[PDB]
Every structure is written in C-alpha cells, then in structure tokens.
C-alpha cells in the first residue's frame, strides 16, 4: 500500500503553457507487473522499529536537540 | 431596450467611433459607409495621436516640464522621419524651428 | 577577429573551426536551407 | 442526418506552422508558432500579405468582411 | 541590374533638353538613383491601386492616379 | 461645438499619466486629428469612385491608410486598425 506520484502525463502537458509539473511519458509496459523479491531484515531493525517510531510519521524530529 | 454599449468601447477605443461614423456618412465621402470603416478609421486616428503625444511628452520631460505645449509638439513632429513626412507641409503655431546652424558658418 | 581566430586555430588544439565567426555564419548552420533545399549546397540558379 | 460530425475537447500539441517541427511558443505581432530564432528572423522580416496566409493554412484566418 | 539600361547617352540627352552645357561624370549615377526613387514611389502607389481593384494587371489609370496622388498630374492617358 | 478634445485627453492620460497639455497645444492636436481624418476619408472616397463602388468598407480605409502613411507608420496603423475591427466583429 505504498504510493508515489511520478508526474503529470505528457498528453495533458500543454493544457496551459507555463504550468509547473514534471511532464513524463506514459509507461510503455504492462500496467500490472508481478515480480518477487527475497529480502532480509536484521533483528536489531525490528528492535528499533518496535521501540521508537521511525522515519515515516516522526515529524517532530526536525527540531533536533532533544 | 437593452443597455447602450458605446461603440468606442465595444471596440476597446477611447476615440468616438460614433462621431467618426457621423462625419464619414454626413461628410459625403460616399453613399454608404460600413461599420468596419468607422472602427478602422477611429483606430488609425488614435494611433497617430498616441505617437505624436508620446514623442511630445518625451520632449517635455527632456526640458523638465509637466505640460505639453506647441513648441514641444513641433520639436516632436520634426525629430521623427515618419511624422515629419506625414506633416512635412504643415505649420504649427507657436512651434518655432529646430536649432540648426550650418557648418561653414560655425567658428573655424 | 579573423586574425585572432587564425592564430587560435594554428596554436590552440581546443579551438575548432566551429567556434569561428565564419562557421557561426554559414549555410551548414541554418535549418531553413536544410528545410527548403537539403544537405546539398545552394541552388546556383541552373536549369534543372 | 449529416449532423453526426463530432468535435473534441482535449489538450492539443501545438506544432510550428512555418516548418513542421514541434514549437513551444508564439508571437504578439503575428501570432505564429515558431521553433527557434532563425524562424523568428524569417517571421519578422517576411513581406506583407503572407503572415496572414500562414494562419490561413492553419485556419482561423478571420479575414475582414 | 537594369538601372544601367538608363545609359550615359540617354542621361546626356535629357540634360541637353534641360539646357545643360557641361555634365560631370558623377551626374550619371546620381540621376539613376534619383530616377529609381521616383519610380519606386509611383509604382508603390500604382500597385496599391491595382491590388485594391482586385486586378493582377497594372493599368494606365493606376499610374495616372499614382502620379496625381504625388502632385505630378499626367494628361494624355485616361 | 464639437472637438476631439476629450479623446485627446484620455489618450494623453493613458500614455503619459501625470503630464497635461496646454489649450493651444490641444487646439493644434485637434487640428491634426481633423486633417488626418479628412485626408484618409478623401483618399478612400477617391478609391471607391475609381473602382465604381458606392461604399467605403474596412478595405477602403485600409488601402487609404497604406497610401497616406509612410513606412513603419503605415504598417503600424494598418495593424491597429485591423485589431480594432477584429475586436468589434468579435463583440
């Protein structure tokens, strides 16, 4: 359930003339790519991810001091 | 009746398309006058007015004055090749001449 | 400019003919000759 | 009958109308799509009576009446 | 070129008709320049009338109107 | 007693907003307007009578402007006039 906006498609590129987006072409492959990945996790990463909230929703960490 | 939209505006003009039309029609230039004709003539009259007045204000600023007068109009109409060709046989009251002294007459 | 460019062409290896004023002013540069006429040189007003 | 022709509503990719190359920007004086500065030079010194024929070839000339 | 078809002899004759006794060699090219400017002015107006009339042929009347426009009224045509 | 004063004033306060113009200068400018009007209208009438037309269309006014005004002046005038007539037609 992870989502990223890559850009605005180049068919709707010249709708206006000085919009500010990243105009990328439509991907010339499948729409449903199915691939499998073997991937490792160390138990210390489990320890850290269960102790403190990490990375994703930890927005108060931009202060820095305490 | 629907609200009266002045033709000058319908046109995006300051000049009176209405009066121009009267003058063309009542002025015997021909039996029939189109709407297009008034519009175009009014536009051309505005353009030349603009050019002259612009050059004149430029001259007035050059002489540190706030008010366009005849001498200013004259110096404007004479420093442009095109306006001076359009008005080459016209005299402007209180306009004066452009400063000019021949070389052979200058001190040697 | 031509005198300086001639000197740079003879002694400077990093200076190519493309960087000369004459090169920046020649048919081979403009696209309109390639659009109307092609990569061959201009028409000398011949018959065919 | 004969009213089955349908228009469109979609972003159009505007190309040049002097040449055929893709052109990204137009002009205020003559309203011509143009590719680069050579075509801009040939647009701003073309003889009169042709700057309207390019819009005639593209359409929406709007000649006077 | 074609302007050099207005030959040195032709210009001489025109100067003679005007009462000119002696002609500097520089007159010939000046005369050609002056003539070309005059013809350009008349032809510009003649073509303008021709275009207005939706014609492709320049007529005698277009030239006569162009000349009258410029204060050089020509009798004998039209 | 009608004069193109009003309009000369509106154009002035559009092109040099804080500058005025004198009464004498207004007179001269109004005379300018009348003169150009007359010349263009008259050339247009002549063109009409010469082409056996009885109407002074936009196209007569255009050709009058091209005969009367020199070079760049003529070109810019044609441009402005065409723009104006186009806007009028659109409205």
> Shortest CB distance from D62 goes to which of F62, F79, F86?
F86
Give, rounded to a whole angstrom, the gap between the first and last alpha carbons of chain F. Answer: 31
Show contacts of B93-97: CB within 8 Å, 24+ apart. Answer: B93/F24, B93/F28, B94/B69, B94/B70, B94/F24, B95/B70, B95/B71, B95/F28, B96/B71
- Experimental technique of record: cryo-EM
Query: Within 13 A of A20's CA, how many CA atoms are on the CB side?
Result: 0
Spatial CB neighbours of E20, under 8 Å, sequence gap ≥ 6: none
* Contact: C31, D36; criterion CB under 8 Å: yes
Please tell me which of the candidates B11, B34, B82 has its beta carbon nearest to residue F87.
B11
Contact list in F for residue E52 (CB cut-off 8 A) is 47, 51, 59-60, 63
Contact D15, D21 (CB under 8 A): yes
Instruction: Give the 3-state secondary structure percentages of chain C, helix then strand then coil, rounded to 5.
Output: 45, 0, 55
Angle F43-F38-F91 from CA coordinates, rounded to 5°: 85
With contact defined as 3+ CB pairs under 8 Å, the chains touching B are: D, F
Measure the N-to-C terminal CA separation of chain C; round to a whole number of Å.
39
F35 CA: distance to closest CA in chain E (Å): 16
Dist. CA B5–CA F42, nearest whole Å: 29
**C-beta of residue B16 within 8 angstroms of C-beta of residue B49:** no
Query: Distance between alpha carbon D6 and the CA centroid of its chain, in Å?
Result: 23
Angle at Cα E72 formed by Cα E67 and Cα E75, nearest 5°?
80
* Beta bridge mates, F21: B68
Ramachandran assignment for B18, one of left (phi > 0), alpha (psi -120 to 50 degrees), beta (any other): alpha
Closest by Cβ to E53, choosing from F43, F46, F51: F51
Distance from CA of D46 to the nearest CA of F (A): 13
Flag whether residue D65 sits within 8 Å of chain B, measured between CB atoms.
yes
Number of compact structural domains in chain F = 1
Q: Which residues in chain A have Cβ-Cβ distances shorter than 8 Å to D10?
A: 11
B33 vs F54: CA distance, rounded Å:
9
Structure tokens at C17: 């003919």
| Partner-chain contact E45 F50, CB within 8 Å | no
Distance CA F7, CA F16 (A): 14
CA nearest neighbour of B45 among E62, F39, E49:
F39
**Residues 48 through 67 of chain B touching chain D, CB cutoff 8 Å:** none
Contacts of F22 (CB under 8 A, 6+ apart): B67, B68, B69, B70
Long-range contacts from E49-57, C-beta under 8 angstroms, 24+ separation: E49/F47, E49/F50, E51/F63, E52/F47, E52/F51, E52/F59, E52/F60, E52/F63, E53/F50, E53/F51
Residue D15 and residue D13: Cα distance in Å, rounded?
Answer: 6
Residues from chain B contacting residue F20 (CB–CB below 8 Å):
66-68
Please answer whether residues F89 and B8 qualify as being in contact, where contact means their C-beta atoms are separated by less than 8 angstroms: no
Burial state string for D15-48 with b = 16 or more CB within 10 A and e = fewer than 16: ebbbbeeebeeeeeebebbbbeebbeeebeeeee
**Tokens encoding B26:** 């009542």
Burial class (CB in 10 A: 0-12, 13-18, 19+), B98: exposed
Distance to chain D for F57, nearest Cα, Å: 8
Q: Which residues pair with B32 in a beta bridge?
A: F55
Closest among F18, F34, F36 to F26, alpha carbons compared: F34
- What is the C-alpha separation between B42 and D62, in angstroms, rounded? 20
Question: DSSP assignment of chain F, as one string?
Answer: ---SHHHHHHHHHHHSTT-EE-HHHHHHHHHHHHHHHHHHHHHHHHHHHHTT--EE-HHHHHHHHHHHS-HHHHHHHHHHHHHHHHHHHH-
CA of B37: how far to CAs of A5, B45, F47, in Å? Answer: 56, 12, 14
Polymer length in residues for chain F: 91
Strand pairing category for B67-68 and B32-33: unpaired
Q: Helix, strand, or coil here: B49?
A: helix
d(C-alpha E73, C-alpha F55), whole Å: 26
Please give the backbone phi and psi of residue D34, each rounded to the nearest 5 degrees, phi first. -150, 150
What is d(CA E19, CA B13) in angstroms, rounded to the nearest whole number?
A: 57
- Whichever domain contains F65, its CATH number is 1.10.20.10
Nearest of B24, B70, B25, B60 to residue B45 by alpha carbon? B24
Question: Which residue, among F69, F22, B90, has the nearest Cα to F5 in the 3D structure?
Answer: F22
Closest CA to F76 of F66, F86, F85, F67: F66
Q: Give the residue on F whose Cα is nearest the Cα of D30.
A: F79
How far is F44 from chain E, CA to nearest CA, in Å? Answer: 11
Whether F59 and chain E come into contact, CB under 8 Å, resolves to: yes
Nearest to B42 by CA among F41, E39, F67: F41
Please indicate if any CB of chain D lies within 8 Å of the CB of C31.
Answer: yes
CB atoms within 10 A of CB B8: 22
**Are F37 and B54 a contacting pair, CB within 8 Å?**
no
Q: Which of residues 1-40 of E touch F (CB under 8 A)?
A: none
- Which CATH superfamily does the domain covering E1-77 fall into? Histone, subunit A (1.10.20.10)
Nearest residue in chain D measured CA to CA from F88: D64
Q: Where are the alpha helices (DSSP H) in B1-108?
A: 7-10, 17-25, 36-62, 70-79, 81-86
Q: Which H helix or E strand runs over C3?
A: helix C2-11
Which residues, 6 or more positions from C25, have their beta carbon under 8 angstroms from its beta carbon?
A: none
Contact between A6 and D6 (Cβ < 8 Å): no
CA C1 from centre of chain = 16
Q: Which residues of A touch D23 (CB under 8 A)?
A: none
The residue range of the domain holding F1 is 1-91
Query: What whole-number distance in Å separates Cα of residue F64 and Cα of residue F43?
Result: 6
- Residue F6 sits at φ, ψ, to 5 deg, of -25, -55
Contact A15 D14 (CB under 8 A): no
Which residues are CB-contacts of F44 (< 8 A; sequence separation ≥ 6)? B29, B30, B37, F56, F60, F61, F63, F64
Geometric angle at alpha carbon F90, from F86 and F91, rounded to 5°: 120
Interface membership of F91 toward D (CB under 8 Å): no
Residue A15 to residue D11, Cβ atoms within 8 A: yes
| Cα gap E40→E33, rounded to integer Å | 11
Give the residue among D45, D23, C29 at the shortest CA–CA distance from D58.
D23
d(CA B25, CA B19): 10
Neighbours of B6 (CB within 10 A): 11
């Amino acid at each position: 359930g992870a989502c990223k906006r890559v850009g605005r498609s180049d068919a709707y590129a010249t709708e206006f003339d000085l919009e500010a987006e990243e105009y990328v072409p439509i991907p010339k492959g499948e729409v449903h790519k199915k691939k499998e990945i073997v991937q490792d996790v160390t138990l210390h990463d489990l320890d850290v991810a269960n102790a403190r909230p990490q990375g994703g929703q930890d927005i108060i960490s931009m202060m820095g001091q305490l | 009746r629907a609200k009266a939209k002045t033709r000058s505006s319908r046109a995006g003009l300051q000049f009176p398309v209405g009066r121009v039309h009267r003058l063309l029609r009542k002025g015997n230039y021909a039996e029939r006058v189109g709407a297009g004709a008034p519009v175009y003539l009014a536009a051309v009259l505005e353009y030349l007015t603009a050019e002259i007045l612009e050059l004149a204000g430029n001259a007035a600023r050059d002489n540190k004055k706030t008010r366009i007068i005849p001498r200013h109009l004259q110096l404007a109409i004479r420093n442009d090749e095109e306006l001076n060709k359009l008005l080459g046989k016209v005299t402007i009251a209180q306009g004066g001449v452009l400063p000019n002294i021949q070389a052979v007459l200058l001190p040697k | 400019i031509r005198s300086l460019e001639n000197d740079l062409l003879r002694y400077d290896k990093t200076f190519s003919y493309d960087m000369t004023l004459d090169a920046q002013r020649d048919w081979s540069k403009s696209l309109l000759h390639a659009f109307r006429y092609g990569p061959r040189p201009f028409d000398p007003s011949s018959q065919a | 009958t004969n009213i089955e022709s349908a228009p469109s509503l979609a972003p159009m990719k505007h190309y040049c109308d002097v040449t055929g190359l893709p052109a990204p920007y137009l002009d205020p004086k003559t309203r011509l799509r143009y590719h680069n500065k050579e075509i801009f030079a040939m647009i701003r010194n073309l003889p009169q009576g042709m700057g309207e024929q390019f819009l005639e070839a593209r359409g929406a000339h709007t000649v006077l009446k | 070129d074609n302007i050099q078809g207005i030959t040195k002899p032709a210009i001489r004759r025109l100067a003679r008709r005007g009462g000119v006794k002696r002609i500097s060699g520089l007159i010939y090219e000046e005369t050609r320049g002056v003539l070309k400017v005059f013809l350009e002015n008349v032809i510009r107006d003649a073509v303008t009338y021709t275009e207005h009339a939706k014609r492709k042929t320049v007529t005698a009347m277009d030239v006569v109107y162009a000349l009258k426009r410029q204060g050089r009224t020509l009798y004998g045509f039209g | 007693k009608e004069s193109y004063s009003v309009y000369v004033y509106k154009v002035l306060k559009q092109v040099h907003p804080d500058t005025g113009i004198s009464s004498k200068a207004m007179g001269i400018m109004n005379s300018f307007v009348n003169d150009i009007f007359e010349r263009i209208a008259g050339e247009a009438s002549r063109l009409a009578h010469y082409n056996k037309r009885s109407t002074i269309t936009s196209r007569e006014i255009q050709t009058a402007v091209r005969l009367l005004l020199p070079g760049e002046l003529a070109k810019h005038a044609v441009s402005e006039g065409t723009k104006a007539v186009t806007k009028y037609t659109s409205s």
